[PDB]
Amino acid sequence: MVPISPIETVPVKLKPGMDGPKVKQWPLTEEKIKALVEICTEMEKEGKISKIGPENPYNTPVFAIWRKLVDFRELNKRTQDFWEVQLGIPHPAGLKKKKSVTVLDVGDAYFSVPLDEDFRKYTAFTIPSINNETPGIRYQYNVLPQGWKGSPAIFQSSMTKILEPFAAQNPDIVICQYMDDLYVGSDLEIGQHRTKIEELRQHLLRWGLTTPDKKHQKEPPFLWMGYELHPDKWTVQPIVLPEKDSWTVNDIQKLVGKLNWASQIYPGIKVRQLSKLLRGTKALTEVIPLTEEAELELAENREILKEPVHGVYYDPSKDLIAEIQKQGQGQWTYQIYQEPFKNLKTGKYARMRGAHTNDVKQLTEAVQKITTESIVIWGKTPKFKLPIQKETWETWWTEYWQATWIPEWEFVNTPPLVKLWYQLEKEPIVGAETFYVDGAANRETKLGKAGYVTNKGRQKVVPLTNTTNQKTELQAIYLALQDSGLEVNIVTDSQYALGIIQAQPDKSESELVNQIIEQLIKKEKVYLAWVPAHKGIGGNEQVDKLV
Amino acid sequence: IETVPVKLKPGMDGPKVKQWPLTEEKIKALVEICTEMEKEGKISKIGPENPYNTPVFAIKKKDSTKWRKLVDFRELNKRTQDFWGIPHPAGLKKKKSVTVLDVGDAYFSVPLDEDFRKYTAFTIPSINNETPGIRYQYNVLPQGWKGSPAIFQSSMTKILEPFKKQNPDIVIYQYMDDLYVGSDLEIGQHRTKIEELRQHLLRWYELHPDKWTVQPIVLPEKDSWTVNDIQKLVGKLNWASQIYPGIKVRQLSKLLRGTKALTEVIPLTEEAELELAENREILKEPVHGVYYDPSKDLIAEIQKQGQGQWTYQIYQEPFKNLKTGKYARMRGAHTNDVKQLTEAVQKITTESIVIWGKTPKFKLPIQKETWETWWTEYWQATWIPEWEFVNTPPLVKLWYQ
Ligand SMILES: COC(=O)Cc1cc(Oc2ccccc2OCCn2ccc(=O)[nH]c2=O)c(C)c2cc(C#N)ccc12
Numbered sequence: 001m002v003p004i005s006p007i008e009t010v011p012v013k014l015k016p017g018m019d020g021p022k023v024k025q026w027p028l029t030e031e032k033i034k035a036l037v038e039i040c041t042e043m044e045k046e047g048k049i050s051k052i053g054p055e056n057p058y059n060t061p062v063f064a065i066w067r068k069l070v071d072f073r074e075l076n077k078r079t080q081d082f083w084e085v086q087l088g089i090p091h092p093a094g095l096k097k098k099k100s101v102t103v104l105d106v107g108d109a110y111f112s113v114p115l116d117e118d119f120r121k122y123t124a125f126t127i128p129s130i131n132n133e134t135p136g137i138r139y140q141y142n143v144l145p146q147g148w149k150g151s152p153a154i155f156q157s158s159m160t161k162i163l164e165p166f167a168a169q170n171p172d173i174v175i176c177q178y179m180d181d182l183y184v185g186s187d188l189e190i191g192q193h194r195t196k197i198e199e200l201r202q203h204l205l206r207w208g209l210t211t212p213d214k215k216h217q218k219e220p221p222f223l224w225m226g227y228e229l230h231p232d233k234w235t236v237q238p239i240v241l242p243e244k245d246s247w248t249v250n251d252i253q254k255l256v257g258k259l260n261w262a263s264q265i266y267p268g269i270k271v272r273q274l275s276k277l278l279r280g281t282k283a284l285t286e287v288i289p290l291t292e293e294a295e296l297e298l299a300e301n302r303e304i305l306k307e308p309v310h311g312v313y314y315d316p317s318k319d320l321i322a323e324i325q326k327q328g329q330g331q332w333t334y335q336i337y338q339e340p341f342k343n344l345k346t347g348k349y350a351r352m353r354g355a356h357t358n359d360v361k362q363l364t365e366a367v368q369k370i371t372t373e374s375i376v377i378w379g380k381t382p383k384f385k386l387p388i389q390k391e392t393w394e395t396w397w398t399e400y401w402q403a404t405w406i407p408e409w410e411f412v413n414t415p416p417l418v419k420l421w422y423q424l425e426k427e428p429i430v431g432a433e434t435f436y437v438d439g440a441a442n443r444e445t446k447l448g449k450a451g452y453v454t455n456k457g458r459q460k461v462v463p464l465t466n467t468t469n470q471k472t473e474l475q476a477i478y479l480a481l482q483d484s485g486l487e488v489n490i491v492t493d494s495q496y497a498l499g500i501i502q503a504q505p506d507k508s509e510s511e512l513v514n515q516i517i518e519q520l521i522k523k524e525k526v527y528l529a530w531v532p533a534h535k536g537i538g539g540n541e542q543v544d545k546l547v
Numbered sequence: 548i549e550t551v552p553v554k555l556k557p558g559m560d561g562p563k564v565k566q567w568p569l570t571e572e573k574i575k576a577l578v579e580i581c582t583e584m585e586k587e588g589k590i591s592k593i594g595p596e597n598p599y600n601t602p603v604f605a606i607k608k609k610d611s612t613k614w615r616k617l618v619d620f621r622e623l624n625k626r627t628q629d630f631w632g633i634p635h636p637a638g639l640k641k642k643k644s645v646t647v648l649d650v651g652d653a654y655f656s657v658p659l660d661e662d663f664r665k666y667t668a669f670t671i672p673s674i675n676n677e678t679p680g681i682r683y684q685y686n687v688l689p690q691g692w693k694g695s696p697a698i699f700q701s702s703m704t705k706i707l708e709p710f711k712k713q714n715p716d717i718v719i720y721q722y723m724d725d726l727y728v729g730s731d732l733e734i735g736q737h738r739t740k741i742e743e744l745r746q747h748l749l750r751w752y753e754l755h756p757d758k759w760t761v762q763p764i765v766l767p768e769k770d771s772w773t774v775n776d777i778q779k780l781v782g783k784l785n786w787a788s789q790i791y792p793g794i795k796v797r798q799l800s801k802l803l804r805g806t807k808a809l810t811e812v813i814p815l816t817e818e819a820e821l822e823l824a825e826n827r828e829i830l831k832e833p834v835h836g837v838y839y840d841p842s843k844d845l846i847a848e849i850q851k852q853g854q855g856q857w858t859y860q861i862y863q864e865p866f867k868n869l870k871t872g873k874y875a876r877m878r879g880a881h882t883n884d885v886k887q888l889t890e891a892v893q894k895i896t897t898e899s900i901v902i903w904g905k906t907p908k909f910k911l912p913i914q915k916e917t918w919e920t921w922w923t924e925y926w927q928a929t930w931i932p933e934w935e936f937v938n939t940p941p942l943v944k945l946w947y948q
Contacts, residue, residue: 010594010595010596011594011596012596013596080596080598081563081598082595082596082598083595083596083597083598083600083682084595085595085679085680087676088676089676090675090676090677091675094674094675094677095675150595153595154594154595156595156679157594157595157679160678160679175678176677176678177678177679361914364914364917365914365916368916368917368920369916371920372568372920375568375569375570376568376674376675376676377674377675378571378674378675379569379570379571379574379674379675380570380571381570397884398853399853401851401912401940401944402851402912402913402914402940403851403884403885403887403888403911403912403913403917403918404884404885404913404914404917405883405884405885405886405917405921427775428773428775428809428810429809429810430810433808434774434806434807434808434809436806453806454806455806455807455808455811457806489808489809491778491809495942498942499939499940499942502940503939503940527809529775529778529779529809530782530942531778531781531782532781532782532785535781535785535796535797535800536797536800536801536803536804537778537781537800537803538800538803538804538805538806538807539803539805539806539807540803
């Protein structure tokens with residue numbers, strides 16, 4: 001017998017202060033008991049488990065469905081935390097094309113890696129006796145049990161330690177681990193590739209690991225985690241938008257799942273309205289009628305999902321490009337590619353939850369998201385194609401009160417373009433009328449007034465019902481913008497209004513702010529000056545709006 | 548050569564912080580560095596039984612193309628037991644010049660407590676999560692951990708004993724991996740003395756706090772005032788009245804009586820000139836009742852002024868500034884706001900380390916996603932302070948300008 005190399009055990013403990021599981025065994029039928037006795041007999045004959053005496057005080061329930069199913073939920077609750085290395089699956093767009101790719105599934109994955117002997121006593125389980133007229137048969141696991149908390153992590157680390165020297169002495173191949181399957185890829189000739197696959201099967205056999213003796217039953221295309229992997233391209237598994245007479249909540253969440261999933265390769269997928277119908281519902285069976293915006297959006301989705309689209313693999317020798325397009329209502333879409341019309345992947349970005357916003361901020365956020373995703377997938381920041389003029393970005397970041405930055409990018413003239421809709425003046429305007437505005441409201445009756453007085457003797461006071469102080473300050477500025485020429489100075493004491501306008505929004509929740517924006521867009525020059533209230537500053541008439 | 552027992556605070560587990568994505572060049576640099584360190588016993592590979600993790604990335608310090616390994620030990624530092632203390636040298640900020648030295652290598656010759664090593668675990672990530680991440684844990688004192696200068700304090704005292712006995716006029720301070728050496732010599736004599744101390748440390752950053760002062764509130768001196776000029780003056784004075792008690796603005800607001808155009812020139816009455824002069828005299832004095840409390844956090848606010856100019860204030864209570872400043876240095880960051888902000892944060896943190904011996908909590912005028920996407924690209928210090936993000940434009944921006 002050729003000496004099998006031992007696999008180093010991973011020292012495992014329980015959570016601090018906790019003890020092993022002690023759960024009462026369930027009564028089983030005589031048929032199930034016989035089945036479990038046969039299965040456990042064979043497993044003991046193989047070495048996966050071993051019989052134990054009555055000294056072991058721990059127990060974990062067992063079932064038969066025949067196949068044995070040990071319910072380790074209690075031991076999982078009581079087992080220490082492990083370093084789970086599977087967090088975020090590899091994205092197909094990050095893979096690099098290989099001439100040959102082979103799949104090797106390892107038989108008896110967990111049942112070939114030994115378990116820490118000082119921990120085996122916590123895996124104890126008992127098989128009930130026929131009519132329970134004898135003590136049940138007590139067993140404990142000698143290898144990683146399927147369903148235990150630490151089986152995937154320990155299996156992955158052991159497989160990594162085994163595959164380390166082979167990967168070191170074979171730099172011309174790439175190996176990838178995923179559950180009980182290994183994916184090897186290389187650009188060598190098919191003969192050299194199959195040869196090195198044989199060498200890998202041998203190197204794994206030196207540790208007692210069995211690979212498919214037959215030809216590997218998995219051949220391209222590979223169906224993996226909703227993906228289709230082909231020798232030269234990748235895509236998502238078929239996305240079918242169903243025809244429904246009425247759409248319920250679960251149908252709409254299925255639809256937004258298929259659309260969110262399909263959006264990573266199908267460009268232009270929009271999900272704003274269909275997900276907007278789910279706002280504050282929290283009812284899985286509630287039927288929600290579809291708005292016309294959602295029906296037209298669904299028609300555009302069916303038009304995009306008409307025929308299959310594929311993505312290419314990553315070529316590290318070519319530059320990485322990401323182009324962004326604005327879609328409206330806070331929706332953005334992007335393609336990441338290296339050659340024109342041949343996308344690596346696609347995606348979308350929806351604006352965050354905010355009361356005020358503008359397009360430049362949203363474009364910046366989208367660029368940051370794409371940057372992080374690209375560093376994840378490809379390990380580098382792509383060059384950007386953005387629908388915004390260089391001069392627009394320069395004016396924005398040079399005049400913005402916050403720090404902001406975009407990585408290397410170039411302008412692409414693909415409408416709609418992102419632009420600055422208004423710019424406030426830095427110094428007061430000579431020859432322009434000066435509007436001193438103010439607004440006030442009563443906290444009880446919700447009655448208020450908003451108005452202005454100007455240097456030319458122009459005045460206005462408007463009464464308002466169902467209003468607040470902030471609303472009357474915004475309304476006062478709005479009136480000043482309504483009744484002034486193309487150039488105007490405005491003096492206010494509202495720190496709230498100045499805080500809104502200095503954030504430079506082009507779209508808001510409050511229709512009042514949106515009207516202020518529409519007025520600013522029409523002006524030539526607007527200078528907004530702030531003064532403290534109640535300081536006896538003439539012109540700023542707080543008593544004119546408190547009557 | 549003998550390990551000192553180190554534990555965590557009662558009731559606190561080890562740090563379990565997610566490792567953020569790194570570029571390919573940084574991953575390669577960390578692989579090379581960590582391989583070299585593993586060959587030297589400074590770190591060792593760990594198995595999946597270690598659930599703890601601390602972020603790690605790579606930088607390139609000043610005047611060097613070699614990559615350096617930086618570990619974000621912030622969580623481990625706040626979860627590590629308090630080590631005890633040496634009173635802060637109040638004369639370090641008074642000295643004419645100070646030079647910062649990196650003494651991190653000296654930490655790697657002292658072994659780390661055996662049972663504490665599992666808490667220093669870090670992970671070199673992989674691109675696209677293809678292969679598992681390379682996990683390491685430290686066997687010696689790691690750079691960036693607060694326990695490394697606390698444990699090495701005795702050895703550092705023994706090494707620096709001859710030099711401190713040789714020059715009683717040279718002040719020596721230590722914070723994390725940095726050694727601050729202050730004196731009053733000439734720049735050439737200071738550089739030769741620094742080479743003397745660095746070879747003295749071998750066989751075993753010009754910074755001038757004297758050219759730094761606290762900044763007063765200044766008012767304009769004009770011959771003709773417009774309505775806008777007086778309105779801004781009254782706004783700034785009303786703001787300063789929160790700091791200085793005797794500020795009075797009624798005689799200047801008396802000039803704004805009537806709705807006048809913003810560009811109209813207004814002459815100052817005698818009462819207004821007297822009021823403005825009294826306000827100047829009040830502003831010339833320091834702030835009433837401003838003290839430092841070592842039990843409280845330091846807060847640093849930064850305002851972007853444009854044209855590469857930045858203003859900052861370090862305080863503990865609102866309107867009680869312990870330090871104010873204006874960083875306007877231009878060093879290869881003319882077209883990048885984030886790089887400017889990051890160098891500003893590093894400089895302010897260094898000043899705070901010199902003055903009080905600890906780092907402040909920053910309030911950054913930047914969106915969380917932008918800063919968290921780009922700040923590691925321009926970081927060159929061995930420590931990392933805490934920060935939060937201000938999303939509403941502060942009105943007091945121009946009152947510090
Ligand atoms: C962690 O591994 C991954 O997630 C990537 C991963 C890589 C992989 O294959 C590879 C193995 C080693 C290096 C590159 C690989 O893909 C390059 C791109 N590709 C892909 C398919 C093809 O024919 N031809 C190609 O040139 C396979 C075959 C996978 C198969 C399944 C399945 N079922 C799941 C993931 C897989």
